[PDB]
Amino acid sequence: GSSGSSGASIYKNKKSHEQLSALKGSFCRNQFPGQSEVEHLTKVTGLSTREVRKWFSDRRYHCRNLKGSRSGPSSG
């Protein structure tokens, strides 16, 4: 029972906001998807389960160590 396939290489392709927006609506609320979220998106976008989950990775990457304007809200 293996899930994490072998060969995780960031890709690049043209997408239609129409679908993009949907995906986001899931992230903004929940950091990372689980089982239900995906099942839904996969239908809201049609993209393969792998494609749907993959995206999430992108958004995160794009927004990494992007601090400066704020002071730094620690976890406490």
Curated annotation (Swiss-Prot):
Coiled coil (UniProt feature): none
UniProt name for this protein: Zinc fingers and homeoboxes protein 3
Subcellular location: Nucleus
Lineage top rank: taxon: Eukaryota
DNA-binding span(s): 8-67
Gene designation per UniProt: ZHX3
Residues passing through the membrane, by range: none
Annotated tissue distribution: Widely expressed. High expression in kidney. Expressed during osteogenic differentiation.
Subunit structure, interactors included: Homodimer (via homeobox domain 1). Heterodimer with ZHX1 (via homeobox domain 1). Heterodimer with ZHX2 (via homeobox domain 1). Heterodimerization with ZHX1 is a prerequisite for repressor activity. Interacts with NFYA.
Region: Required for nuclear localization, residue numbers: 11-69
Function noted in UniProt: Acts as a transcriptional repressor. Involved in the early stages of mesenchymal stem cell (MSC) osteogenic differentiation. Is a regulator of podocyte gene expression during primary glomerula disease. Binds to promoter DNA.
Family classification: Belongs to the ZHX family.
Part of the full-length chain shown: 494 to 556 of 956
Induction (record text): Up-regulated during osteogenic differentiation of mesenchymal stem cells.
